[PDB]
Amino acid sequence: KPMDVVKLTLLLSILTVAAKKTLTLVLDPFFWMYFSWTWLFWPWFIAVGLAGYGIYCFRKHWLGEANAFEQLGIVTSVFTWLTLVPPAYFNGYLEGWPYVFFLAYHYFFFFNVSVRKRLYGDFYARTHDPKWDVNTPLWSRILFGVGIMVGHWLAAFEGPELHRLPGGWANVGIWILIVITMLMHYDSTLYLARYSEKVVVPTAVVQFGPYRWVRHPIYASTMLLFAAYCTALRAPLSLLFLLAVCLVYYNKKAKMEEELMVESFGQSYSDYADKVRHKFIPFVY
Amino acid sequence: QFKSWIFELREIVREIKNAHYFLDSWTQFNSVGSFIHIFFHQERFRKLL
Amino acid sequence: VFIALLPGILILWFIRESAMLLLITSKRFLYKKYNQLFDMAYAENFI
């Protein structure tokens, strides 16, 4: 047909002019020189494009067709802009804490994923009772998230300049505190998951390990790694604001979950709570 | 008859994903690989402590 | 100097391991072939 010839000639002409533009751009000296001028600003471009890729994958996951790679990508983007970026912009350079705590977050997110591949067939959601999962109004969730970021960025900014923090024997505290929070979180998750049949359907009351020191050790361990990042950069006020916002939201969510298991288990969780009152901090809260 | 050579080759391959006995370099390779495997797994990391 | 000296050692190690694998595979193949040739003749009758 002649129309095929006409459209092929049109495509050839468009390809010819596009390749002419491409060839005169490739051999252009000023284009390459300005390319090298904008080569100066490379680490901030990946840090911002990962935000776009993350929000795209996050909208897809909100729709519900996200592969596990996109979910871990959202996790990685959050961990990069919460533990790699705050001292990459407010100091201009990374050395010391940010890489360690960025990998520490990736290490700390990976127990509910690791345990639920080991003591399961896969990550496939088992059919369960709809009132078992704790749900909270979305404005409260985003308020908690915003407060957490405000605390972390405030620790980054109020904290001093990067390479001036000391070393030697003063950097053993973050080591032991991080070991403690990982150990206590792992114990809490293991003791919570070794009894439940489904994803969150407990059968008996857990009163072993950190549960005999505190009523909510998972939340307090997340709290303690928050404090660990904030203490690695030696900023008390942002630690206090982080403590305030996490106390508010975690206490709200702990109150709903506590009244749920009080209603569901009867006297058992009541005597468990009488044995250990302190909800978040040992003999402080 | 060339299939017998491949049979012996991949049977030796099967044997070297075991610890019957062989040269020392491969044993050191498997030992450092097993150390890496133990170290990377967190549920295998905690039981070391 | 360490990363400079590494690749020669590594490529020679791969050469050694490949030669070892080829020699051992050929040894097993010739052993079974010679035993099978002997066993057509001296063992139970054969097919």
**CB nearest C29 (choices: B4, B25, B26):** B4
Residue A259: closest CA among A152, A151, A131:
A131
Distance of CA C14 to the CA centre of its chain: 15
Instruction: Work out whether the CA dihedral A187, A193, A196, A197 comes out positive or negative.
Output: negative
- What are A65's two structure tokens? 């067709």
Q: How far is CA B34 from CA B16, B17, B38, B39, in A?
A: 14, 12, 6, 8
Q: For the beta carbon of residue A56, count every other beta carbon within 10 angstroms.
A: 13
Give the B window 10-49 contacts with A, CB below 8 Å: 42-43, 46
Ramachandran bin of A235, using left for φ above 0, alpha for ψ from -120 to 50, beta for the remaining angles: beta
Instruction: Report the C-alpha gap between A42 and A54 in whole angstroms.
Output: 19
- The SS3 of residue B35 is helix
A118 contacts in chain B (CB < 8 Å): 43
A152 closest CA partner among A234, A80, A229, A54: A229
CB-based contact A184:A244 (threshold 8 Å): no
Pair of tokens at residue B44: 């295998």
Q: Tell which residues of chain B come right before a gap with C–N over 2.5 A.
A: none
Signed CA dihedral, A262, A282, A233, A167: sign only: negative
Question: In this structure, are residues A159 and A98 in contact, taking their beta carbons and an 8 Å threshold?
Answer: no
Distance from CA of C4 to the nearest CA of B (A): 22
The span from the CA of B12 to the CA of B6, in Å, is 10
Tell me which of A181, A184, A186 to substitute to probe the interface with B (most B C-beta atoms closer than 10 Å): A186
> Which residues neighbour A273 within 8 Å (Cβ) at sequence distance 6 or greater?
A215, A258, A262
User: A53 Cβ partners below 8 Å, 6+ apart?
Assistant: A73, A77
**Tokens standing for residue A97:** 């804490």
Tell me which residue of A134, A145, A163 sits closest to A245, measured CA to CA.
A145
**Cβ contact C25–B4 (<8 Å):** no
**Residue whose tokens read 């088992």:** A126
- Reported structure resolution in angstroms: 3.3
Closest CA to A221 of A241, A195, A246: A246
Experimental method: cryo-EM
Contact A111 B42 (CB under 8 A): yes
Burial group, residue A87, by CB count within 10 angstroms (0-12, 13-18, 19+): buried
Residue A272 CA to residue A274 CA, distance in Å, equals 5
Residue A56's nearest CA partner among A43, A44, A69, A45 is A69
Of A50, A246, A77, whose CA–CA distance to A145 is shortest? A246
Task: Specify the 3-state DSSP secondary structure of A73.
Answer: helix
Tokens of A207: 């009163």
Helices (H), A84-133: 86-89, 97-109, 115-118
- The tokens of A170 are what? 């003063």
Q: In the 8-state DSSP scheme, what is residue A125?
A: P
SS3 C37: helix
Buried-exposed string B24-49: b where 16+ CB fall within 10 A, e elsewhere: eeeeeeeeeeeeeeeeeeeeeeeeee
φ, ψ of residue A57 to 5 degrees: the values are: -65, -30
